[PDB]
Amino acid sequence: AMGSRVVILFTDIEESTALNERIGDRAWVKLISSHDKLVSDLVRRQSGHVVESQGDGFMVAFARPEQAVRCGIELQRALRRNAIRVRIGIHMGRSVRRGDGLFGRNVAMAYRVAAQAAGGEILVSQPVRDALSRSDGIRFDDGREVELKGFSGTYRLFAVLA
């Protein structure tokens, strides 16, 4: 349908509710605020754009898939340095721009991919894994077929290595 091709990145903090209940709102608000600041800096460093700031994570838009992945790699490296565990999913395709937001099935797919990822892991769809086959120095695993809610059939998702 309508829209231009874009790379969509979704973050998703693992077990944020349990963490919130554990440290309390005061400590939680301070933590997520610093987290928001961290993600914001890294996204800008890869020419990305934070589209929406959900309660647990963010939706981010990039022009190039390599920008999105590299942002993910740097984000995971920074979080481990501070050690919160975060899931990262990356998908690309056409998406409908409405206002300053993004809508469509590929937006849903993007989060779906992120939801399959483990804490501290970066997962990507096959189109992203294909667009980036021969790119130094980004390496993927062998992939795995998974069923995703709302979509028929199966989809192969790939994790970023190192």
Ligand X SMILES: Nc1ncnc2c1ncn2[C@@H]1O[C@H](COP(=O)(O)OP(=O)(O)OP(=O)(O)O)[C@@H](O)[C@H]1O
What residue ranges bind Ca ion (CB under 5 A)? 12-13, 16, 56
Q: What, of a second copy, ligand X, Ca ion, none, does residue 32 touch, CB below 5 to 8 Å by kind?
A: a second copy
Stretch binding a second copy (CB under 8 A), from 24-32, 67-75, 79-87, 132-140: 24-32
Would you tell me how many other CB atoms lie within 10 Å of the CB of residue 19? 16
Contact string 107-126 vs ligand X (x = CB under 6 A)? xx--x---------------
Query: Are 44 and 110 contacting, i.e. CB atoms less than 8 angstroms apart?
Result: no
Q: How many CA atoms lie within 13 A of 122 on its CB side?
A: 25
Q: Does 108 bind a second copy (CB under 8 A)?
A: yes
- Phi and psi at residue 65, in whole multiples of 5°? -65, -35
Last residue before each break in the chain (C–N > 2.5 Å): 83
Interface with a second copy by CB under 8 A: which residues?
A: 1-3, 15-18, 20-21, 24-26, 28-29, 32-33, 52, 54-55, 94-96, 98, 103-105, 107-108, 111-112, 149-152
